[PDB]
């Protein structure tokens, strides 16, 4: 079995929203030490790499490596479920054909449980290689967002220049 419980249901929703917009079918690989996901978009110019360590779940347990393939559209329909303050728990028993998302509110009052049929999805081949980079900057993500959104108006290409 896999059993991973989030403190905040909001977290997972907010992570899927982070990338349901470029890749649509992704395989989530669950391990003893957390979950990772890689996927390339269709144009094959953009790779998305997710990693969630154990210290993001309030309670994590994964007996064996398992891979769940999800349609991210399907998945976020279900992620619009409950109060988004709530404890969300993923559950898959091993060799799974569905995943279970179990919302519960702090009080034993309500308990919504969803099951999502899984997908068969091909692994692509990519592996990543870090290499150092000529430059590294960090800035508020809201600022970068505004810049990109704004300059987006004018061209289909934005150019970055550091000097």
């Amino acid at each position: 079995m896999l059993e991973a419980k989030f403190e905040e249901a909001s977290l997972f929703k907010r992570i899927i929203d982070g990338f349901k917009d470029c890749v649509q079918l992704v395989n989530f690989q669950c391990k003893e030490d957390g979950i990772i996901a890689q996927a390339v978009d269709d144009s094959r110019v953009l790779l998305v790499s997710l990693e969630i360590g154990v210290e993001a779940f309030q309670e994590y347990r994964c007996d064996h490596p398992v891979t769940l393939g999800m349609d991210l559209t399907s998945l976020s329909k279900i992620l619009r479920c409950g109060n988004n303050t709530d404890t969300l728990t993923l559950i898959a028993d091993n060799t799974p054909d569905s995943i279970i998302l179990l919302f519960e509110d702090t009080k034993k009052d309500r308990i919504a449980e969803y099951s999502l049929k899984l997908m068969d999805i091909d692994a692509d081949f990519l592996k990543i290689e870090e290499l150092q980079y000529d430059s590294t900057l960090s800035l508020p993500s809201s600022e970068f967002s505004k810049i990109v959104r704004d300059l987006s108006q004018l061209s289909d290409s934005i150019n970055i220049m550091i000097t």
Partner: protein, 172 residues
């Protein structure tokens, strides 16, 4: 109490020196110190922390410095001095934002840091950048690493984890 002391490299690339100082000491010591060793004079030299021109009268808790942070020494510039420029040229016109690395100590979640080793000039597809920014929901800050050779890395950090986007630059 808190750390009360930290260590900083000071490099020009062939020659580095490490120091440990209180977080309250003006950097003059280290800047004069590095300068004497170099043969060169104190003020014939340009000093920047993460892209920011610093001046001898300043403290490390001012720049909101980490442990193991780096100051770089360059020969006098233009200047006063590195910058990031985003530009789009389209059909209707053109756009140009220039941002300068800076640190506001009062509240530093806002600041702008820049390790430049090589200068770079790259173009990307605004359609892709538009999806990448959808991760702004996950993180106060964004980390961007740029290679004139590899795809660019855009990283949003979580508490134990991250969302990374690697995006190939355009050619022409």
């Amino acid at each position: 109490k808190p750390e009360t002391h930290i260590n900083l490299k000071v490099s020009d690339g062939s020659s580095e020196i490490f120091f440990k100082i209180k977080k309250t000491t003006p950097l003059r010591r280290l800047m004069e110190a590095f300068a004497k060793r170099q043969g060169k004079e104190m003020d014939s030299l340009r000093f920047l922390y993460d892209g920011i021109r610093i001046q001898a009268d300043q403290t490390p808790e001012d720049l909101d410095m980490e442990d193991n942070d780096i100051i770089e020494a360059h020969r006098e510039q233009i200047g006063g001095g590195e910058t990031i420029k985003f530009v789009a040229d389209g059909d209707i016109g053109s756009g140009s934002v220039i941002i300068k690395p800076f640190v506001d100590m009062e509240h530093p979640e806002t600041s702008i840091k820049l390790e430049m080793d090589q200068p770079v000039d790259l173009t990307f597809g605004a359609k892709y950048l538009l999806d990448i920014i959808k991760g702004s929901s996950l993180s106060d800050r964004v980390g961007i690493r740029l290679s004139s050779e590899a795809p660019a890395l855009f990283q949003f950090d979580l508490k134990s984890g991250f969302l990374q986007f690697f995006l190939a630059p355009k050619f022409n």
